[PDB]
Design a protein around this ligand. Structure first.
Ligand SMILES: CCCCCCCCCCCCC/C=C/[C@@H](O)[C@H](CO)NC(=O)CCCCCCCCCCCCCCCCCCCCCCC
Lengths: 470, 156, 48
């Protein structure tokens, strides 16, 4: 699924083994110096080896504090050590870098003159948020008006909105499935989905990432073998897939997945976290870009953090599914309602996207998010880099493959006034370290042109042009 | 200066600890580390090739035994210590026995001991040791020695 | 010797005397015969 140059797959294992060897050696001279209030230690000796022997070496590439709105250009605060690199502290000095590590695709995480004036007015009339849950006193009028805009937008009959995009997967999967069920998940699913599956009693299998000929062969075996020990019938089967598989940048093969789930009478659980304002000619997600009937999928989970510039989540489906969840979902019963100015800013963003604001800049954003991604991705391939994903996706990871290139590609770019994101080993597979580039609809062409020459010059030093240029 | 592209497939294996041992390039590095140690030993202190192969076989004993058969658990806290009563050898391949990658790991301590004996003229000063080392390695990797301990030493 | 063996999964852990009791309680048998109808019950002549 990823083409790896053979000579680089060898100098990566060597680079990791050298780190392992020096780390064990150094940790062996600490265990004999600890000779100089009775409870067990907070953490054992060797459960955080790669946290203190690999992460602390490059800890200045993460948790960079900024002091400006998440815009195309922000200010980055500078940090010193003051005690030989153990606890970084922040100065007063700042910079002015190009934002390429945020998520605001449509450029809503800013001050725009249709949403912020309405949200400020919906603040001084409702005071932040209610202190009760939604079934007691936290269902304001704004919370009832917003659950209609989401149903109109997404397309399904009814929807529920929560206040966290991570609790939208750990507090719902236990409700729909329980013990005796099955969950054929995709390999590269978020942590929230797997934690939600663990919170119930269901069994989890995994089919190969983004290929249906392997999804069929797993369903056949699992229905022909029943429960793992007492070969009862499987009470249910649910298949979980994602719209755009981030950190791989690929659009899912939805038409070929739904067709196989219909045949074996399994259910489908879609996850449009990255693809609900980005892809599509109207912004309706993958079910519109790929031309699939929205009633073939049973549940559709989403998130407003990335595109609409406001926290939250939702679930949409048949009108009895929503009635069941509103009566038996712990996140709906026990948790405080989503704040009011954080719901007005979703209402007034869906109005802009649908063009009901009077102006017509709801289509300029949707066109400029595409004419920027198709340009950046095309230009990176011509210089010989290795970028993944298709042509219609806001994310494009660049593969690095070497643990030592992670602090080298980031420190140079920050020094030349460009900010990016890099991902290491403990989170990713060992061999696949990458950098993630996020392109928004607020970047101008003059910025992408200037940022491509900064990247092309840094990529010569590290030698990450694995493919041949022209 | 880059050729020989390989299209690696992701085996699910759902375990950070023992999934990296399936991507292309592991065997070659395994052997090149051994061939690199052999040359570096007889450069920092000029000696006979036989002894140097002996020092390689003795260093490869402690490193491999302490890593594959002594340590238990995983260094990643994400799985909430699901594998606390298992060693790295037992976690491999979800407990599947006699696979392609287990036979390669079984076959190396033998072939490396043959080389350290055939160039040291057997004798007894080194023969006694090398035999003990290879014997310990091969016994620890037997299919029947699965989740079984010796007198309950480092067993629970 | 080894380079010719076959990969096998480790043996499974047998059912307990408690689990079997449940399976013997969920199982339900079908009726011995199908339910009768009214066309199914015509008597033949009795002659002398
Ligand atoms: C200088 C060149 C190398 C110098 C020595 C390097 C030896 C280090 C390799 C040891 C492999 C450890 C395998 C499992 C260890 C587990 O115990 C621990 C905790 O459970 N897992 C972890 O820390 C994370 C699991 C994966 C981390 C492995 C990173 C190292 C990747 C190298 C593997 C491929 C290259 C070597 C193949 C196996 C090497 C066998 C040792 C060779 C003996 C060398 C002595 C002359």
């Amino acid at each position: 699924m990823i083409t790896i140059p053979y000579l680089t797959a060898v100098s990566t294992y060597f680079s990791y083994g050298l780190l392992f060897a020096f780390g064990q050696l150094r940790d062996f001279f600490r265990r004999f110096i600890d000779w100089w209030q009775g409870y067990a230690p907070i953490c054992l000796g060797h459960e955080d080896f790669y946290i203190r022997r690999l992460y602390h070496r490059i800890q200045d590439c993460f948790e960079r504090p900024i002091s400006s709105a998440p815009d195309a250009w922000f200010d980055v605060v500078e940090r010193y050590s003051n005690d030989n690199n153990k606890t970084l502290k922040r100065t007063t000095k700042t910079s002015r870098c190009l934002n390429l590590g945020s998520y605001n695709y449509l450029g809503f995480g800013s001050f725009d003159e249709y949403c912020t004036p309405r949200v400020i007015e919906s603040l001084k009339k409702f005071s932040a948020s209610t202190c009760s849950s939604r079934v007691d006193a936290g269902t304001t009028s704004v919370h009832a008006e917003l659950e209609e805009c989401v149903t109109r937008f997404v397309g399904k009959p009814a929807a529920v909105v929560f206040g966290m995009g991570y609790a939208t997967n750990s507090a719902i999967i236990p409700v729909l499935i329980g013990k005796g069920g099955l969950i054929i998940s995709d390999s590269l699913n978020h942590s929230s989905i797997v934690n939600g599956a663990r919170g119930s009693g269901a069994t989890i299998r995994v089919f190969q990432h983004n290929t249906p000929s392997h999804l069929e062969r797993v369903l056949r075996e699992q229905i022909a073998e029943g429960q793992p020990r007492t070969h009862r019938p499987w009470k249910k089967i649910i298949v979980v897939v994602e719209g755009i598989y981030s950190m791989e940048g690929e659009i899912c093969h939805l038409p070929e997945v739904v067709a196989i789930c219909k045949k074996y009478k399994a259910y489908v659980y879609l996850d449009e976290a990255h693809s609900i304002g980005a892809i599509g000619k109207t912004g309706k997600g993958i079910c519109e870009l790929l031309g699939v009937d929205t009633a073939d999928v049973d549940v559709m989970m989403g998130t407003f953090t990335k595109s609409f510039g406001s926290c939250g989540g939702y679930i949409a489906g048949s009108k009895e599914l929503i009635q069941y969840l509103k009566h038996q979902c712990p996140a709906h019963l026990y948790a405080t309602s989503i704040p009011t100015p954080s719901a007005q800013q979703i209402i007034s963003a869906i109005k802009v996207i649908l063009g009901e604001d009077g102006s017509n800049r709801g289509a300029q954003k949707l066109a400029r998010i595409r004419e920027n991604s198709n340009f950046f991705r095309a230009e990176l391939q011509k210089m010989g880099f290795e970028v993944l994903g298709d042509n219609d996706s806001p994310v494009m990871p660049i593969m690095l493959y070497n643990p030592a290139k992670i602090p080298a590609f980031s420190r140079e770019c920050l020094r030349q006034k460009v900010a990016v994101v890099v991902v290491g080993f403990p989170a990713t597979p060992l061999l696949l370290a990458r950098a993630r580039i996020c392109i928004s609809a607020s970047h101008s062409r003059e910025d992408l042109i200037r940022a491509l020459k900064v990247i092309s010059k840094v990529g010569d030093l590290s030698g990450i042009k694995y493919f041949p240029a022209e | 200066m880059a050729n020989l592209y390989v299209k690696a497939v992701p085996p699910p294996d759902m375990n950070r600890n023992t999934e990296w041992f399936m991507y292309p390039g592991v065997w070659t590095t395994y052997m090149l580390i051994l061939f690199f140690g052999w040359l570096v030993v007889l450069s920092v202190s000029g000696c006979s090739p036989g002894m140097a192969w002996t020092v390689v076989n003795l260093a490869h004993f402690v490193v491999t035994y302490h890593s594959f058969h002594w340590m238990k658990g995983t260094p990643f806290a994400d799985d909430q210590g699901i594998y606390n009563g298992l060693t790295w050898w037992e976690q491999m391949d979800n407990g599947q026995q006699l696979t392609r990658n287990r036979k390669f790991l079984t076959l190396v301590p033998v072939v490396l001991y043959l080389i350290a004996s055939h160039t040291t003229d057997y004798r007894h000063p080194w023969l006694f040791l090398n035999t003990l080392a290879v014997m310990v390695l091969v016994v620890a990797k037997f299919p029947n020695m699965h989740k079984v301990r010796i007198f309950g030493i480092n067993g629970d | 010797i080894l380079l010719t063996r076959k990969s096998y999964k480790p043996p499974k852990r047998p059912l307990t005397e408690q689990e079997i009791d449940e399976l013997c309680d969920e199982w339900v048998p079908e009726p011995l015969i199908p339910p009768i109808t009214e066309d199914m019950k015509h008597e033949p002549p009795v002659l002398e």
